[PDB]
Design a protein around this ligand. Structure first.
Ligand SMILES: O=S(=O)(NCCCCNCc1ccc(-c2ccccc2)c(Cl)c1)c1cccc2cnccc12
Length: 321
């Protein structure tokens, strides 16, 4: 069957931690009282959560309350544990409290308040660097986000702040573990997910990040538009080319679902110049394209790490200032 894989970095960080750190099923959640919060207004609905601005009436602080839709208790424990483990890290959303409604018994996460919110080449580089700080941090702490995408990035330009949010899909990396491929939004799914390669790692997040970068510098949202998980990889293959795809499939001895043999065909690797146009050219640089090229690889092992990405020339100006 498939050839195994291990993270190039942060491989064993969880093995070296106490079990309690990663064994979130055993975490006991103490719920506070929702009636210490009064909801003010709805901020937006998500797949498994609806978010409100609220007030803590004990001390009149503005906070954000994320009411969880029905999801298995294991997954609520997982998100809480991850948020607690990451709390205080660079650009990580800060979990303030965990509450349950006294009637409905529906659980809610309470966060620190941030505003949600014409982008300059510099701005994109800056905010991408800020995302990379959060990803390097969470990866270094043994956690994959698994859902990096614009909806999960809060940006307050006034204060030039960035928070990575919605850790509901995040999971701990353990070398050798086979994960669920049925995660992430379609447009941001890595090739590993699409070919059903389960022994994936932090590198998934780097693909998703590359997808984001492509969408912004090229003004094409989504960049890889798909009509079905199958067609999603077809769209990727039409850009990255089929030679490298089949090389990856061979290397890991991956078996490609029937619904893929007569749909991928044969495609050249397309040069990034083909996406550049007069109304995005101000966002596109040799540096940007070199960086993007080094994120968007089929082979998860060959993608830049977060820390490597931060050292790329695209970010030299940001690092300076
Ligand atoms: O409504 S909400 O549920 N979510 C909405 C957030 C929308 C963020 N997307 C905008 C965005 C961010 C970054 C980029 C970017 C920048 C530079 C380079 C590349 C991409 C762009 Cl172009 C766009 C929510 C709201 C408030 C607090 C919450 C607190 N906790 C949970 C949810 C929360």
């Amino acid at each position: 069957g498939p050839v195994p894989s291990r993270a190039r970095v942060y491989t064993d960080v969880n093995t070296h931690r106490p079990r309690e750190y990663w064994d979130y099923e055993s975490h006991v959640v103490e719920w506070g009282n929702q009636d210490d919060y009064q909801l003010v207004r709805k901020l937006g609905r998500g797949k498994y959560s609806e978010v409100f601005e609220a007030i803590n009436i004990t001390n009149n602080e503005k906070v954000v309350v994320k009411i969880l839709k029905p999801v298995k208790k294991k997954k609520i424990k997982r998100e809480i544990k991850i948020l607690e483990n990451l709390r205080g890290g660079p650009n990580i959303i800060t979990l303030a409290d965990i509450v349950k409604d006294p009637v409905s018994r529906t659980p809610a996460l309470v966060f620190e308040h941030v505003n949600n919110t014409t982008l300059t080449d510099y701005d994109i580089r800056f905010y991408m660097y800020e995302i990379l700080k959060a990803l390097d941090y969470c990866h270094s702490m043994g956690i994959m986000h698994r859902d990096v995408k614009p909806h999960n990035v809060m940006i307050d330009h006034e204060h030039r702040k960035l928070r990575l949010i919605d850790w509901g899909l995040a999971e701990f990396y353990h070398p050798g573990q086979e994960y669920n491929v049925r995660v992430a939004s379609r447009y941001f799914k890595g090739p590993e997910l699409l070919v059903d390669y389960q022994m994936y790692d932090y590198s998934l997040d780097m693909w998703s990040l590359g997808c984001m970068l492509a969408s912004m510098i090229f003004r094409k949202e989504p960049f890889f538009h798909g009509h079905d998980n199958y067609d999603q990889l077809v769209r990727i293959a039409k850009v990255l080319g089929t030679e490298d795809l089949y090389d990856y499939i061979d290397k890991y001895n991956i078996e490609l679902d029937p619904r893929f043999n007569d749909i991928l065909g044969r495609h050249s690797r397309k040069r990034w110049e083909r996406f550049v146009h007069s109304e995005n050219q101000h966002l596109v640089s040799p540096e940007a394209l070199d960086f993007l090229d080094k994120l968007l690889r089929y082979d998860h092992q060959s993608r830049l790490t977060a820390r490597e990405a931060m050292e790329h020339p695209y970010f030299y100006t940001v690092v300076k200032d």
